[PDB]
Structure 1
Amino acid sequence: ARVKAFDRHCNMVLENVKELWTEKKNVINRERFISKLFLRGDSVIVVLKTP
């Protein structure tokens, strides 16, 4: 997703969120579109940025 704001805590507003994960039991990869999100920086492990 694209980032709207920053925090000291890396609380991040995100706009037009794609999110995607992996159900491993076999595997179904599930995706969800969430347009306006406010994400706490505690869960945030690694922010990678594409050019």
Structure 2
Amino acid sequence: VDKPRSELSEIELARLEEYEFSAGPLSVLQQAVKNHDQVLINCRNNKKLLARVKAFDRHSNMVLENVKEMWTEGKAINKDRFISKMFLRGDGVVLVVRIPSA
């Protein structure tokens, strides 16, 4: 939409906020929630997150349920951990990659 000026009042700030998820990079979380797709998320401490994303924030603060979480580290040994539900601060996100359900 034709208002990326970044000098906006509240109504147009909200308009750009919704448009950004309508079409921008963060749009992937929208149809990831709607389609309930597998998403792999990596934190900044080299931790792996696979789960459904029930909801997400504009700051990418996402609530995750059914997380498949693995961390690696003696000899390199891979270990996993399943948590039913979690709230993730968008600060620690490095990447999200969607695994299409179909």
Q: Does 1:14 align with 2:64?
A: yes
Structure 1 unaligned residues grouped into runs of 5+? none
Overall identity of the aligned pairs, in %: 72
Match for residue 92 of structure 2 among 21, 37, 43: 43
Q: Deviations over 1:2-51 (max 9, x none)?
A: 0011101100000111100111x511111100010001111111000011
Bigger fraction of residues in strand: 1
Q: How many residues align?
A: 50
Determine which structure has greater relative contact order: mean sequence separation of CA pairs < 8 Å that are 6+ residues apart, divided by chain length: 1
In structure 2, what is the Cα distance between the partners aligned to 1:40 and 1:30?
Answer: 23
Q: TM-score, normalised to structure 2's length? A: 0.47
Structure 1 stretches of at least 4 aligned residues deviating more than 4 Å after TM superposition: none
TM-score (norm 1): 0.89
Give the RMSD, CA atoms, in angstroms.
0.9
Any stretches of 5+ residues in structure 2 without a counterpart?
1-50
Distance 1:6 1:17 in 2: 15
2:93 is paired with a residue whose SS is: coil
Q: Bigger radius of gyration, 1 or 2?
A: 2
